[PDB]
# Entry
Amino acid sequence: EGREDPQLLVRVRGGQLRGIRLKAPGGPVSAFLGIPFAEPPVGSRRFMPPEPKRPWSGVLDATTFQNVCYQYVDTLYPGFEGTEMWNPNRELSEDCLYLNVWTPYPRPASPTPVLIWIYGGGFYSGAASLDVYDGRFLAQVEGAVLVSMNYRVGTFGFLALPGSREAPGNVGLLDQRLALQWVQENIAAFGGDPMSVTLFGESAGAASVGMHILSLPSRSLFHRAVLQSGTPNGPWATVSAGEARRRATLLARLVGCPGNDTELIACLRTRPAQDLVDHEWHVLPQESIFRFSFVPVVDGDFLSDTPEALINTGDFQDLQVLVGVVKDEGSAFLVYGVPGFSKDNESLISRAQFLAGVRIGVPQASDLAAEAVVLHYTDWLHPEDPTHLRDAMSAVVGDHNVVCPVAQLAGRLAAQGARVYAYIFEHRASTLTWPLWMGVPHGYEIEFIFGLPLDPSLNYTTEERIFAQRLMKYWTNFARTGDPNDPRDSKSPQWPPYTTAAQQYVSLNLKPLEVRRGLRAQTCAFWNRFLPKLLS
Ligand SMILES: Nc1ccc2c(c1)c(-c1ccccc1)[n+](CCCCCCc1cnnn1CCNc1c3c(nc4ccccc14)CCCC3)c1cc(N)ccc21
Ligand SMILES: *[C@@H]1O[C@H](CO[C@@H]2O[C@@H](C)[C@@H](O)[C@@H](O)[C@@H]2O)[C@@H](O)[C@H](O)[C@H]1NC(C)=O
# Structure
């Protein structure tokens, strides 16, 4: 003070922040970027739960994105937008526990509903600073307060020797919880309403939102939840205590760390961060798709039991959730090492490649279980047809990992109190750089929900701009009221709740909302009711 914009000075519990007035297409928004919310988790704090940020003096500059959490950089297709857009856009550091706030400009006069975004990336990658998570459009067009946080990924976030003090597990989830606490204490300073906080997230972000729903301390920190293309139940989002111990111990051996828990973790704490990242992928029990080395653990603490036990016995009377999937959940995963598949050709595969693909996609399956999958997905009229085999391989991955875990989740919640709305997102961005065969891949509804197409410089179609406006309106209506439908609007077709009785959900595309029934019901009976029994 006291030259300098007076609408950009805010005090939080830790001291003064100076934000930055950014431009959105329709007008200005306030951004407070790189606010630290924890003591840097470095040195003797690696693998430890986060400690709250100690207060500072002077004005903290909150005008730029801060460091991204240490992680593996994707180099499948170097220079290719389709992969590069998910890669870190700030330097990598273990000092990375910072969050971001976008608010209208000037800041809202009455308490506004808050959306908190939790990025995905297999629990090994992601950053809140990526272009596709820019909160400026929701802030400007919908008047939302939007917050997003960095949380520790990979080993730093999730390496666990369960039972130990030095490496308890789930610390990445604990980072996210600390940011939720920081929102409760501080968000009013920005004109947000701590009594109206909605969590939303996609992929591992979605599974995280889910874990917060199933964890007691978290439940008093938010009111409503959105889970896009991910769930806490299912094959990849968690691991048993035993399995996490196994993986931690193997990684320790692989980097030279040999023999009780204190010694082992102390040695790990002296290894360069990059060394851990360089070995991260070597601890998986089988060759596999849609599996990640270091993920939330079932510790009997953050997670008192498996997500499955918790969804089946929890009381969800007070909860409102929006859940959904994209048309082609599996397709992107196939180019990460499934033989026969690529972004540069049509990936027309053979029957042999489809069976080999299934062993990889369902790694936990016996010979019998795998034959069951293959038989179920074969087109018996054209069983050698390479186009169908390619689409089948895709659907096997997508159904087993996302669609059917989502279906089970929606079903259990609705059955046990929750108001649940469900969607399938079916529009392929006209600006998409992946080939057509991949359809609508994992992650490609995000840029629409966040309103990117409203940026004229981005080259989306006019109808796409209107489409993003609809979606932003649904997401923010849901944040505001627990119901995505416009209360005043009469002309627009209604989005009904999902129920066990009727199993209704909506198509999200360029055409007006169509109500559909049964979310791959038949096939999800195979994956959710039959396959588990067969694995015995
Ligand atoms: N060159 C290879 C070949 C085989 C394997 C390799 C790499 C990698 C890999 C390791 C380090 C860095 C990058 C990749 N992974 C690790 C996981 C790979 C999963 C890739 C897809 C994904 C899913 N969630 N996060 N990501 C990482 C990339 N970020 C994306 C994200 C999203 N969507 C997409 C869609 C298309 C391409 C990328 C992508 C949406 C959410 C967030 C991230 C595999 C994992 C396996 N279980 C098997 C094979 C391979
Ligand atoms: C499609 O591509 C897969 C990956 O191979 C890569 O791309 C092709 C176009 C070649 O130029 C190759 O040298 C690259 O490494 C192949 O494994 C697969 O066999 C291909 N399938 C068909 C049907 O052509």
